[PDB]
Design a protein around this nucleic acid. Sequence first.
RNA 1: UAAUUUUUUAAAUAUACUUAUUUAAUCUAUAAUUAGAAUAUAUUGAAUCUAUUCUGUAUAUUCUUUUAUAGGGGUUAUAGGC
Lengths: 79, 48, 48, 49, 103, 129
Amino acid sequence: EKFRVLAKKTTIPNRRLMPPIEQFRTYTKQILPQMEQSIEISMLQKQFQEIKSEELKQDLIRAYTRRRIKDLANQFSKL
Amino acid sequence: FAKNLDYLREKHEERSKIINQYLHRMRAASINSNIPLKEILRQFISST
Amino acid sequence: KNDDQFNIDTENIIDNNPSIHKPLYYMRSPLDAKQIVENPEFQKFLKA
Amino acid sequence: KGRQYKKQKEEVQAIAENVFLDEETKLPYGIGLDDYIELIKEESITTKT
Amino acid sequence: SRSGTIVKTMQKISDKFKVKQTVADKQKLQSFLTEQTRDGSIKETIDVTAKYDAEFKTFIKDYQAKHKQYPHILDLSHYSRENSTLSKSNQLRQEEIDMIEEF
Amino acid sequence: HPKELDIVDYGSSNSKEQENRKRGERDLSKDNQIEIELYRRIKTDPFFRHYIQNEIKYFTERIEDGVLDIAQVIVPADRKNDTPFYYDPTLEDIPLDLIGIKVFASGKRKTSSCLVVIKEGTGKVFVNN
RNA sequence: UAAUUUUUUAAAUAUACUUAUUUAAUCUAUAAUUAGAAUAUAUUGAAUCUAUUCUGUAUAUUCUUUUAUAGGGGUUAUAGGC
Ligand SMILES: [Mg+2]
Ligand SMILES: [Mg+2]
Ligand SMILES: [Mg+2]
């Protein structure tokens, strides 16, 4: 129903009867890096396996940080 | 399964080296030491 | 070969159960390594 | 988890359980002056006797 | 907080390379097993290492059957008093008298 | 000074605890009721019985160890893990527990005091009849 | 095919109103994230020199703090009087 009459000459209508914008930001900020770090590391641990020296190992990591910190420098440039 | 076995080899070797230090020093505490008896015990207690 | 189980003797705490003031010696959900071994699965993988 | 919040009548009736008169007395015991009562029970007796 | 986020990340990163998603060496691993399988030294390795770490216990806990859950040790003395049998009332009569005489 | 009490103070004393029942630990003070609960538990606890047997000994070993350093002119100092392990219960995970239709509504201002009585019906209003 | 208004009698109920009395400040559940302090342990990094120190992160504890999710309910936290 839509309308019901209470009494004589009293009609009233009755009353007793996936956001995208978050879907984007949750992908950009949270989901990408967690998917990336699992990739960006496993591509490196394999590369550290064949090597047996401890000099190269600790320099690739420290080079990976520089190349990953620039990613944040761009974000703060934005609003 | 094989990774979790490497997860032992680190620890068993860690626990072995730490112990084999104490064993060496009790052979030294038998000789090189003022207070030989306690060093034999202190180095046990830290192993506990 | 009944040298496998592990007990606490919750009635007479200290007299029967030694070193009970040290946690690593005494767990809340203790293991039975013999079961862990004698599972046929665990024997296969190591041979694998 | 029965309510400690008690109404009046329970607090009133809880008192009368402990106090009680006696026909020769018509005075209450459980209030604390039970000693003074036992004078009068004797005094009424010692006079007549 | 730009200078703060930079620092927190670099240490998060360093912690993950310490994790081992893979094998390190095989000759060591195989030689490690043959030595211990030779005489049955494996059980000691499992018991001791399982005690001062849970992560190895969690992996091996599944292979085990017939688990037991005792109380926690600190809450054990309290657990025994609450479960006092009728026989233990014999003690509690004495232990009630020993203090009353004091008081 | 004797504490006089009133007619009303008799309801709780006897109705709560009957004279027919015996007397027990619950009838005592709490500060005494706790000591019993300590006297019945410490006999079983491993920590207290261990720490208290050995308390004097810790007080001496720290002196003998210290006098060496005064004899070997080095300042006194403490080593690591000289003591036993004892449970740090904070680091350990213990249980927290062992185990029709009406409405009446009011509203207020400086001095006024309104009382409302809602009933089902047409849109219809009254105030003080 | 009704029952307006007013007065009176008898009883129950709780909601104004009256009295006494208790409490009253900044919250939870979780998560991420920020700001920072206290300890204890572990620990990367830093020594142009008090590295028996400083900093950072984690763990537990001790209070504090942003945002989110959901849901939970506000003043008295003030203003006079004596
Ligand atoms: Mg008023
Ligand atoms: Mg009421
Ligand atoms: Mg008042």
